[PDB]
Amino acid sequence: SMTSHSWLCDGRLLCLHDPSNKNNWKIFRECWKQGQPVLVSGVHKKLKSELWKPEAFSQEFGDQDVDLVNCRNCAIISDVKVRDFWDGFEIICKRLRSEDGQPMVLKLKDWPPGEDFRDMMPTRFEDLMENLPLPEYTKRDGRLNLASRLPSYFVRPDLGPKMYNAYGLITAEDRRVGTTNLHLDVSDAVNVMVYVGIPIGEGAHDEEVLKTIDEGDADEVTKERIHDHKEKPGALWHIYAAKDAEKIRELLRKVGEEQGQENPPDHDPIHDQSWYLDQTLRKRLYEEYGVQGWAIVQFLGDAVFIPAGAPHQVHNLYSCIKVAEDFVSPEHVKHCFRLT
Ligand SMILES: c1cnc(Oc2ccc([C@@H]3CCNN3)cc2)nc1
Ligand SMILES: c1cnc(Oc2ccc([C@@H]3CCNN3)cc2)nc1
Ligand SMILES: [Cl-]
Ligand SMILES: [Cl-]
Ligand SMILES: [Cl-]
Ligand SMILES: [Cl-]
Ligand SMILES: [Mn+2]
């Protein structure tokens, strides 16, 4: 039967089921005020599916010049055409290969560039902004979005949205690599999974995705979403409470020193965006510092709400197109104030 909401993460994560129900705020508000992330399912059913396909981005925008990142070693592939990324998104035989001959795992960097999404893609911009959940919080002029209403004593977010495009990590060695490394934002954000590409035939890798889920931190009900095989899984997130950010910096300073990095005692390993917490590091964080996080699998059409100040990292299971909007809720405005 259809219901308003359910729980994941053993009751610690709210999952809203109807992205457009006008009463969602009544359930959302208390979880948000406590500094928890929230998940909203079903946003893909509200969107124009033909606007969000890899082949359409390649046809319309393929002659633009871009840089790519090699996820495995952080090497920059400079000044290539954006079609060279899009045409290998799902079809592994058409995908760029390393010198050694393996298909690469690539991220498309800063595309569309800066604040240019609205100008470059006006029909995509309208389809996303009109269908965002919790619209009093997430729309540019929502009543509970302070972004347009604050003075210069507050860091204000850039005009959005921002698109995040990257291939899935493939091998057992790739399990310890991030798509986006551990970092935090001083604004709130909503991140929507608009497309998942699952390769078939030549370079399929379904067995290592299921291993990664079965051997990892995820709760039994999320494992009972993977195994049902009704919905496409896109990306594995880990999110930590804003109150635990300094304990995480203490662990990463200790691990940087153990690995022979030579860092001043004040340096900020979260701002550096250089670390991915693998299973070994997540267990050390729990046992040595007493810090627990939220392990979240973002499926097609899931919207992840990330509280301001919360450290987070992302690991793509399959090839993903994500679209994110920043906002400034009253609950978390302290995180962007420039004094004390
Ligand atoms: C048609 C429509 N909806 C259902 O189930 C629901 C869905 C959403 C809710 C909301 C969400 C916020 N407050 N209650 C309650 C019941 N079933 C058939
Ligand atoms: C409706 C029905 N079926 C689909 O296809 C898929 C394809 C792959 C999965 C993954 C694989 C790993 N765990 N589940 C799930 C659903 N899509 C929409
Ligand atoms: Cl467009
Ligand atoms: Cl709302
Ligand atoms: Cl990164
Ligand atoms: Cl907070
Ligand atoms: Mn982020």
UniProtKB/Swiss-Prot annotation:
Full protein: residues contained: 1380 to 1717 of 1761
Described function: Histone demethylase that specifically demethylates 'Lys-9' of histone H3, thereby playing a central role in histone code. Demethylation of Lys residue generates formaldehyde and succinate. May have tumor suppressor activity.
The organism's place on the tree of life at top rank: Eukaryota
Mutation effect (Y167C): In DIJOS; uncertain significance
Cellular compartment(s): Nucleus
Disease: Diets-Jongmans syndrome: An autosomal dominant disorder characterized by varying degrees of intellectual disability, developmental delay, short stature, and characteristic facial features such as a wide mouth, a pointed chin, long ears and a low columella.
Note: Its gene is located in the 5q region of the genome which is deleted in del(5q) interstitial deletion, a frequent deletion found in myeloid leukemias and myelodysplasias, suggesting that it may be a good candidate for the del(5q) tumor suppressor gene.
Family: Belongs to the JHDM2 histone demethylase family.
Annotated coiled-coil segments of the chain: none
Written domain comment of the UniProt record: Leu-Xaa-Xaa-Leu-Leu (LXXLL) motifs are known to mediate the association with nuclear receptors.
Chain residues that bind Fe cation: H183, D185, H312
Lineage of producing organism: Eukaryota, Metazoa, Chordata, Craniata, Vertebrata
Protein's recorded name: Lysine-specific demethylase 3B
Tissue: Ubiquitous. Highly expressed in placenta, skeletal muscle, kidney, heart and liver.
Domain JmjC residues, every copy: 121-340
